[model samples]
Target: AICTGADRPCAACCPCCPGTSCKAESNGVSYCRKDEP
Candidate 1:
């Protein structure tokens, strides 16, 4: 998925999103969150 910076991100690309999805903010900040339902 895309990061806060609008760049493609993954566990390797971003440690914050390791094995999880990311949520980008309008301020260009992103974080990793559990996607488990």
Candidate 2:
């Protein structure tokens, strides 16, 4: 989705960044919940 770019499942399942947690939504986009830090 847009928030996660073209990444299908988003960083939650497919992390684009090294330490970013993404949460999926009904809009087919993902939200970055938290950073791995």
Candidate 3:
């Protein structure tokens, strides 16, 4: 539920985790993945 965050969707609020950031999926929706080091 983390990598996908909320197990739903995301937006400007960005309810993602600390280590991850917002990213877009192929479906035109958004989610949280990982950030570049």
Best prediction by lDDT: 3
lDDT string for model 1 (1-37, tens) is: 5432224432446454344567666777665666666
Assess every candidate by TM-score. 0.35, 0.32, 0.42
lDDT of 3 by residue, 1-37 (tens): 3334544466664467766667678999887666667
Candidate 2 lDDT, 1-37, residue by residue in tens: 3345333356544454444456678987776554544
Q: Rank order by TM-score, top first?
A: 3, 1, 2
> What lDDT score belongs to each candidate, Candidate 1 first?
0.50, 0.52, 0.63
Q: Which parts of model 1 have CA positions greater than 4 angstroms off?
A: 1-12, 15-19
Each prediction's number of clashing residue pairs: 0, 0, 0
Candidate 1 TM-score, C-alpha based = 0.35
* Most accurate candidate by TM-score: 3
lDDT, ranked from best to worst: 3, 2, 1
Model 2 CA deviation exceeding 4 Å by range: 1-20, 35-37
Clashing pairs in 2: none
